[PDB]
Amino acid sequence: PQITLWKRPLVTIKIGGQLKEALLDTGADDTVIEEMSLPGRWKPKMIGGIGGFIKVRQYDQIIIEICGHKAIGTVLVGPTPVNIIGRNLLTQIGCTLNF
Amino acid sequence: PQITLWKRPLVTIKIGGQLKEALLDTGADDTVIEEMSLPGRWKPKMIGGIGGFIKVRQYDQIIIEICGHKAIGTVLVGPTPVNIIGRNLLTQIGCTLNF
Ligand SMILES: NC(=O)c1ccc(S(=O)(=O)N(Cc2ccc(C(F)(F)F)cc2)[C@H]2CNC[C@@H]2NCc2cccc(O)c2)cc1
Ligand SMILES: [Cl-]
C-alpha cells in the first residue's frame, strides 16, 4: 500500500500472540513496544531523544506480523508512549519513503 | 526519490540560507530543528518525545527546502537529538510510505 502522512501512520501488528497498534516510524533506529512478555533472553538498553532517555529490554529474533508481512528482528520493550515499528523491521517489509 | 531504510534517512535541508542535515521522520508529528535564529514571533508548544514532554518554540510559515523540495510551514526550535523533518512538512513535499 501507499500511506500518506496527514495523520500518524498507524497499523495493526501481531507480536507475541497479541494484536497491537503501532506507528511506522522512519526516524526510529529500533522497534519499541509497550510493556509485554516476550520469549528468550534479554539485555538492558537505553534509548533517547526529545524528553530524555528510557530504559528498555532488548529481545532478539522476535517475529512480528505487520500488515500481512512477517519479519524478524530485535524488539525493545519498555515505557514508550507509542508502539513504534522502526527501521530494523521496516526494511524487512520493503518499506520506502517516496516523493 | 525513493529512499530505503537500511540507514537513517538523512537528507540536506536549507533553512535561513544555511544547509543542515535532517532526518525524515514519519514518527514525528512536527518538524524540530536545533537552536538557530528564525524570523518573526514565536508561540509556545509542548511536544511529547520518547522520554517525556518538553516545551519548544513554534515559528510559523518558515521557508525550508528539503532534499531540494520547497516547503513553507511550522518549524519548532528546541533540544532535539538531530534535526527532524516531521509529518507536517513531509506531507507538503508529497512524501508517502510505500510497501
Ligand atoms: N512531536 C514531534 O515532532 C516529535 C516527537 C518525538 C520525537 S523523538 O522522540 O525525539 N523521536 C525522534 C528521534 C530521532 C532520532 C534519534 C536518534 F538519532 F538520536 F537516535 C532519536 C529520536 C522519535 C520520533 N520518531 C523517531 C523517534 N522514535 C522514538 C525512538 C527514540 C530513540 C530510539 C528509537 O529507536 C526510537 C521527536 C519529535
Ligand atoms: Cl534487528
Ligand SMILES: [Cl-]
Ligand atoms: Cl531494499
Ligand SMILES: [Cl-]
Ligand atoms: Cl505546517
